[PDB]
Amino acid sequence: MLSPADKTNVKAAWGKVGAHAGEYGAEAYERMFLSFPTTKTYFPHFDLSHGSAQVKGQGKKVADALTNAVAHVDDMPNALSALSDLHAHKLRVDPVNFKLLSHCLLVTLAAHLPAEFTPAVHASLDKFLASVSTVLTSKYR
Amino acid sequence: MLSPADKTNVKAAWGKVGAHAGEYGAEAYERMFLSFPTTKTYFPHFDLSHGSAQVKGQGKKVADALTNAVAHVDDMPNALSALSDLHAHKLRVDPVNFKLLSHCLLVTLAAHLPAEFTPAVHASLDKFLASVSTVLTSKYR
Amino acid sequence: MHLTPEEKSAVTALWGKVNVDEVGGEALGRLLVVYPWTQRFFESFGDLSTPDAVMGNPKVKAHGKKVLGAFSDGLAHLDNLKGTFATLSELHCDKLHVDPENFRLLGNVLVCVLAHHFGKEFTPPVQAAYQKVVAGVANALAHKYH
Amino acid sequence: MHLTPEEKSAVTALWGKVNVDEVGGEALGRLLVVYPWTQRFFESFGDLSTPDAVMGNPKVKAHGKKVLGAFSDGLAHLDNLKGTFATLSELHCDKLHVDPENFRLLGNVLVCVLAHHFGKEFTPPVQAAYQKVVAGVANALAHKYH
Ligand code: HEM
Ligand code: HEM
Numbered sequence: 001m002l003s004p005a006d007k008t009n010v011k012a013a014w015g016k017v018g019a020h021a022g023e024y025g026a027e028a029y030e031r032m033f034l035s036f037p038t039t040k041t042y043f044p045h046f047d048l049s050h051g052s053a054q055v056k057g058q059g060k061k062v063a064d065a066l067t068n069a070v071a072h073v074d075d076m077p078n079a080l081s082a083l084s085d086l087h088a089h090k091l092r093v094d095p096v097n098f099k100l101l102s103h104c105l106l107v108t109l110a111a112h113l114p115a116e117f118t119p120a121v122h123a124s125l126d127k128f129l130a131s132v133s134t135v136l137t138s139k140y141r
Numbered sequence: 142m143l144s145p146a147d148k149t150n151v152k153a154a155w156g157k158v159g160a161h162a163g164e165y166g167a168e169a170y171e172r173m174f175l176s177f178p179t180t181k182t183y184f185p186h187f188d189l190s191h192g193s194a195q196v197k198g199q200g201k202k203v204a205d206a207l208t209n210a211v212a213h214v215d216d217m218p219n220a221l222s223a224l225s226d227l228h229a230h231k232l233r234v235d236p237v238n239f240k241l242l243s244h245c246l247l248v249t250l251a252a253h254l255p256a257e258f259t260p261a262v263h264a265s266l267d268k269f270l271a272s273v274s275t276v277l278t279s280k281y282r
Numbered sequence: 283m284h285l286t287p288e289e290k291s292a293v294t295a296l297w298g299k300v301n302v303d304e305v306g307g308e309a310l311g312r313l314l315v316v317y318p319w320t321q322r323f324f325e326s327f328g329d330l331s332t333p334d335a336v337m338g339n340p341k342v343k344a345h346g347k348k349v350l351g352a353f354s355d356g357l358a359h360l361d362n363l364k365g366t367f368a369t370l371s372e373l374h375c376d377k378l379h380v381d382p383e384n385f386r387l388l389g390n391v392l393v394c395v396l397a398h399h400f401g402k403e404f405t406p407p408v409q410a411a412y413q414k415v416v417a418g419v420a421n422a423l424a425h426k427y428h
Numbered sequence: 429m430h431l432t433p434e435e436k437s438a439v440t441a442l443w444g445k446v447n448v449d450e451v452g453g454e455a456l457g458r459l460l461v462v463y464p465w466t467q468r469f470f471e472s473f474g475d476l477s478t479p480d481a482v483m484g485n486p487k488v489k490a491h492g493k494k495v496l497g498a499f500s501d502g503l504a505h506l507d508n509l510k511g512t513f514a515t516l517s518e519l520h521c522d523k524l525h526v527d528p529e530n531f532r533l534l535g536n537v538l539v540c541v542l543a544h545h546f547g548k549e550f551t552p553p554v555q556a557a558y559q560k561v562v563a564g565v566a567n568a569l570a571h572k573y574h
């Protein structure tokens with residue numbers, strides 16, 4: 001459950017991310033592919049080399065959806081409805097993998113936001129990505 | 142999310158368990174301690190040998206709480222509220238362990254209900270325990 | 283892998299009573315019912331729409347027997363699981379693209395299926411020895427992923 | 429464990445820049461903050477009530493220094509982590525009762541601390557080598573559990 005302080009922390013940290021959200025989303029996917037090689041089994045059809053346009057577009061789609069969930073943080077199940085539908089019925093990513101991306105997004109944010117990535121914001125960000133992951137896997141069965 | 146068919150399946154399977162619930166709860170803990178030895182770190186004060194009354198007592202307590210959850214399946218968070226508080230702020234069991242007991246419960250059920258443990262009921266029971274687990278770790282942070 | 287003499291014996295005695303085709307069909311079918319996202323690998327298998335359709339699909343039963351067959355052959359080489367599954371590990375990664383987490387899910391449904399089939403003979407201690415084996419097999423299969 | 433020569437050099441050059449006491453206190457503190465159930469072990473350490481009270485707790489900082497100093501010494505023995513952490517593994521299991529999952533959580537917080545500390549120097553391939561190191565260390569520490 002996100003408390004009010006969590007919501008404030010997330011809206012401030014993501015506000016600072018701003019126009020780089022898309023580049024940060026691509027770097028987290030590239031960090032995940034190199035640190036956790038089994039996640040590449042969901043992207044056989046992609047050119048996975050550094051800076052590939054396919055990875056850059058996936059990073060931008062994921063960032064947009066993250067932005068949308070921060071904007072609708074009190075109503076996330078309704079705002080991510082189509083996304084949860086697509087992951088549950090078409091992509092069918094094992095729900096273990098969501099934790100790996102989340103960790104890699106956190107490492108991406110740490111590396112880029114020296115001043116904002118405090119212990120309490122770190123805590124809030126981790127809880128927010130666990131809730132986004134929960135909503136995305138809610139219709140799996 | 143538990144469907145109407147899932148709730149029907151759980152009440153039926155739990156109904157047949159009946160007065161053995163306590164014995165099945167102890168057997169599940171014993172299965173868990175032998176298969177996943179890291180789970181013994183939460184009970185350093187217990188006699189862990191087969192037949193221990195301490196293990197039998199724990200099995201009976203856990204069985205009674207699941208009976209109460211089955212009885213209030215459309216209002217789980219309120220019926221398990223005190224148990225959620227207790228695991229969150231004093232026992233502090235890491236979440237991974239909840240999936241290990243849930244698997245051992247299932248194994249225990251399969252070994253004792255060979256006619257009722259159908260594929261469909263196996264799926265509903267697993268969904269039901271994941272839901273009880275989620276409610277129990279809801280207040281951890 | 284290191285199995286005590288008692289664990290090796292428990293694993294081997296029970297496995298002599300298993301009908302590998304029936305248990306393989308059951309285990310794979312139950313994987314597809316209980317964790318439906320695993321159906322992403324079997325699009326060409328036919329109707330998987332409900333539990334009864336899954337459990338009765340002949341393509342699911344033929345694959346199940348194949349899978350447990352190669353599993354069964356690994357039980358004869360418990361001291362070198364990695365060397366035994368090397369070739370199939372590479373195949374599952376480079377040609378099939380199967381997330382190794384599915385090996386773990388199948389290993390746990392297989393344990394459920396043994397307990398359901400053997401009842402009170404699948405005792406705590408015997409489940410412990412099989413949990414080590416299915417984790418060892420999943421490990422060996424994921425070993426050549428890259 | 430098997431690290432390529434490039435990975436080993438990447439691990440060793442970063443770590444020559446680390447202030448072990450500083451990062452140790454930071455990593456343990458943030459563990460206690462982000463995953464509050466890990467505070468179960470440290471009820472004698474005093475006030476753990478808020479993030480600032482954890483981060484400023486002298487006993488948290490002392491324990492951190494000790495934990496990271498042992499980690500640091502393991503980095504010199506990357507080819508024999510099991511042998512290096514064997515006695516510490518036994519103590520965490522028989523006397524301290526620490527669920528090994530805690531080691532894995534600490535390893536992921538430690539990686540977030542290094543990225544926060546080193547910024548763009550902590551590149552995707554540097555992170556990959558440290559992920560392998562922290563998972564190796566966590567496995568070595570959980571090796572003697574029984
Ligand atoms: C924070 C969690 C995640 C979010 C918000 C997210 C969001 C998205 C979005 C917005 C798309 C594009 C949908 C469209 O084109 O309509 C997508 C596609 C996809 N995602 Fe997810 N995703 C998440 C986690 C994951 C993970 C962990 C993986 C795999 C390890 C994954 C694998 C994929 C794949 C394979 C596609 C389709 C790629 C293509 O063929 O274009 N996603 N995701
Ligand atoms: C369905 C999941 C679970 C339920 C319903 C459950 C429920 C309970 C209940 C009713 C109690 C007794 C509280 C009292 O004294 O009034 C309890 C105690 C306890 N539980 Fe949980 N629990 C579950 C899972 C776990 C797991 C996975 C672990 C750790 C591996 C665990 C560790 C403990 C411990 C250590 C105690 C206290 C033992 C003592 O008397 O010293 N529980 N649980």
Ligand code: HEM
Binds near residue numbers: 320370374
């Ligand atoms: C105990 C673990 C497993 C073993 C020992 C095993 C073994 C095998 C074998 C012997 C084959 C036949 C190879 C060929 O000549 O084409 C195969 C194929 C295959 N396996 Fe695995 N398997 C295991 C688990 C799984 C799991 C859990 C999945 C997916 C959820 C899976 C997905 C597949 C697929 C998609 C094929 C290709 C079937 C086809 O031709 O369409 N396997 N496996």
Ligand code: HEM
Binds near residue numbers: 496565
């Ligand atoms: C890289 C991971 C870790 C390493 C290398 C490590 C190492 C150590 C060392 C060197 C000691 C002192 C040994 C002695 O007194 O003989 C120790 C004690 C201890 N460790 Fe660990 N440890 C690690 C992770 C953890 C974690 C994650 C926790 C719990 C969250 C933990 C809990 C403790 C406790 C409670 C003590 C006893 C402290 C005291 O008596 O003041 N350790 N550890």
